[PDB]
Structure formats: C-alpha cells, structure tokens
Design a binder for this molecule. Structure first.
Ligand code: BZS
Ligand code: ZN
Length: 375
C-alpha cells in the first residue's frame, strides 16, 4: 500500500500507512498561510476484501474544524464517479472507512477541478459563438487568469460579472462555471437569447490557479486571502484581484456574483450587501427579486445562511461588498455546500460537481428574468 498527493490539487502528509485498519494522515497547511482543511490523495496497492480505516489526525486544528461534524468524505476509483463514504468526527480527528472494490482509489474534500480540466473548459468556451478571451491576467506564479466575454449583440448595454474560486479549496465554484459556460452551447435557448440581447457576460472561471494547483484551501501563492484584498489590491501580492479590478474599471459592472463554497452550512444560499453604506432601497429590492426567482428554479434556499450585517457595518475588503458599492450594482456571494443541500437529500453523492453545474445554469435563468430590472 502506498499513499501520495504529488499531483494537481493534491494535499496530504502521510504519517503511517502500514496498518490498513489504522491509517494515519495529516492535512497540509497552505503554501504561505496557516489555513488548511482541503485534502486530496491517492491510495495504491490496497489489499482486496479488506476494510481500510483512515484518520486525518490534525482535522481538529483545521481552519474550520467545527465544519467536520456531519461531513462525509468523497472518494473515486476512476476519478469520474465520486461517492460519499461513512465518516465520523471526534477528538482524534476525521475518520472514514472503505472496503475498496479496486486496488486504487482517491479521496478528497470535494470533487476536484484540475487546471487540466480548466484548460479544456477554456478551449470549449472559445469555440462557442460570441465567446472570446477578452483579457488575461497573471497569478503570482505566472498562471493564466482568463476573463471571458460572451457577446452576441453589439447593442447590449449591461455587463454581468461572475468570478469563481478566489478560495482554492472551494472546487464546487469552478464546477458552477463549467455548467454556466456549457449551457452557452445550446442551439435553441430562448432565455439566453433574451439575456444576451440586453447584456454581455464577463466570466473568470478561476481566480486562484496557484492555490488550486497546490491544493491550498484559503490563500494564493503569496499567502493572501484574495477575498480580503478588494479594498487594497496589490499588483505584487494579489495580482489576481488587481487584474479583475482594472478590467471592471474599463468596462463597468451592472451585476456581480462571487462564487464560493461553505464548509459548515448544508444548504445552498446567497449572501448580499445589506451591510454596505451604499445599500439602497433599489438594491434591497433587487436582492429580494434575485433570491425569489432563483428559489423558484434551482437548488437554492433562503432559510439558512450567514448572519446578516448590521446597517453600514459591511467589510469592504470583500469582493461582493466592494464591487456592489463601487458600481452600485446587484451583487451576491453564492455559496454551495461541501456537505449536501439537505432540502434535496442525495446522501450517496452529497453536493457534487454535477449539481454545481446545474446551479450554474439555473442562475442564468434567473438573470434572464431580472435583466430588465438591473438598471
Ligand atoms: O469563504 C467563504 O466562502 C465565505 C466568504 C464570505 C469569505 O469569508 O470570503
Ligand atoms: Zn470562499
């Protein structure tokens, strides 16, 4: 038996894998920050007809250790079909067991989205009618930050921005983008026809390629939390955010969605800008419309989420608040669960890459409905 993480988005430290019934492992802290929670490794040469019991020993010291409770690890034999496995959490850490049908299998905190797939996603995007790579930024380690624009009518006047995965460990985010982009390949898509008549789409499939490649959870290569750098972006420390802000200034913003993933809450939800000094009645109305329309179409609810912000007490270092206020536009942070969307239980897979994609396409339907109210 051999366990490794020497690959894209891999993360794990092997303690002792000599006894299948007592496998010890540790989660690796981010490149330049103390945060950790995301894990991704492969096991090879497992004995057949044998139970293998795994334990992430430092789960208790992870960034969000209270989120472990109720969480079921994800696994895959072919890296295509991912399934949930029996898991428990106590003082010794996160435990999960599996009697593998195959000699090899891989585990991860969520269905990984590799930079390899990212590349194929961009390729397909550029092969789509009206889709272009409007501009490209560069990460701290020199990886591409594509800004794709979907434009099918030279007279549209609205700019709808959607960026994802500023936090590397939140892989469900890029899955959301894949679904959103792929819907653009439909021949007779009436809703999209209307949307694109009035607006152009500005998409950044991945805001932190270095973090994602290195299996980080929270920060970019420099150790900076990108969703805390919007008030004071750095060309050197947070180039990913700096790039996006320059382009936003060039073209303008009339809508902004920041796609994330939440470790704790087992529900898909959306946080707004109610704490912004610039939170107007118009924006409060639009936020109500958006949630109302999305709730009627996708796996999205409004009962659970983060505590709301008191009037004028928002943290403008956050993308959602910063963009919404700077441009006086509807803005939300979309949150997908690492667990399941309990409203629609599917224990065998929990929240997945597929359900993330579907949410991405449902969100497009919501935008089509609200396009005439944004401005
Ligand atoms: O991390 C997240 O998804 C939550 C988000 C608000 C933040 O804390 O940036
Ligand atoms: Zn996040």
């Amino acid at each position: 038996m051999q366990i490794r993480a020497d690959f894209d988005s891999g993360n794990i430290q092997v303690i002792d894998a000599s006894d299948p019934r007592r496998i010890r492992l540790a989660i690796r802290p981010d490149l330049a920050s103390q945060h950790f929670q995301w894990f991704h490794f492969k096991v090879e040469g497992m004995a057949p007809a044998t139970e293998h019991c795994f334990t992430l020993v430092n789960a208790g010291q992870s960034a969000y250790s209270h989120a472990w409770s109720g969480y079921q690890a994800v696994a895959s034999y072919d890296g295509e079909r991912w399934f949930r496995v029996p898991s428990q959490y106590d003082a010794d850490g996160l435990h999960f067991q599996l009697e593998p049908e195959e000699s090899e299998v891989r585990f991860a905190y969520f269905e990984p989205y590799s930079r390899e797939r990212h590349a194929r996603l961009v390729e397909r995007a550029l092969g789509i009618e009206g889709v272009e790579r409007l501009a490209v930024g560069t990460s701290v380690q020199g990886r591409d930050i594509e800004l794709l624009r979907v434009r099918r009518h030279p007279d549209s006047h609205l700019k709808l921005w959607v960026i994802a995965q500023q936090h590397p460990g939140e892989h469900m985010a890029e899955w959301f983008m894949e679904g959103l982009i792929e819907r653009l390949q439909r021949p007779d898509d009436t809703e999209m026809q209307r949307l694109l008549e009035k607006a152009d789409l500005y998409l950044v499939p991945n805001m932190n390629p270095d973090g994602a490649f290195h299996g980080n959870l929270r920060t970019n290569a420099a150790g900076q939390d990108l969703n805390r750098a919007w008030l004071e972006p750095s060309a050197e420390r947070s180039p990913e955010v700096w790039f996006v802000q320059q382009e936003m200034k060039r073209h303008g913003v009339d809508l902004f969605l920041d796609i994330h993933g939440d470790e704790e809450i087992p529900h898909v939800f959306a946080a707004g800008c109610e704490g912004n000094p610039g939170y107007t009645p118009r924006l409060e109305r639009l936020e109500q419309r958006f949630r109302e329309e999305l709730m009627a179409r996708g796996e999205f609810q409004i009962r659970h989420g983060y505590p709301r912000s008191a009037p004028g007490q928002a943290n403008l270092a956050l993308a959602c608040n910063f963009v919404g206020q700077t441009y006086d536009c509807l803005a939300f942070t979309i949150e997908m669960p690492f667990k399941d969307h309990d409203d629609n239980p599917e224990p065998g897979t929990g929240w997945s890459g597929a359900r993330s994609k579907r949410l991405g396409q449902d969100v497009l339907s919501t935008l089509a409905v609200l396009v005439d109210e944004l401005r």
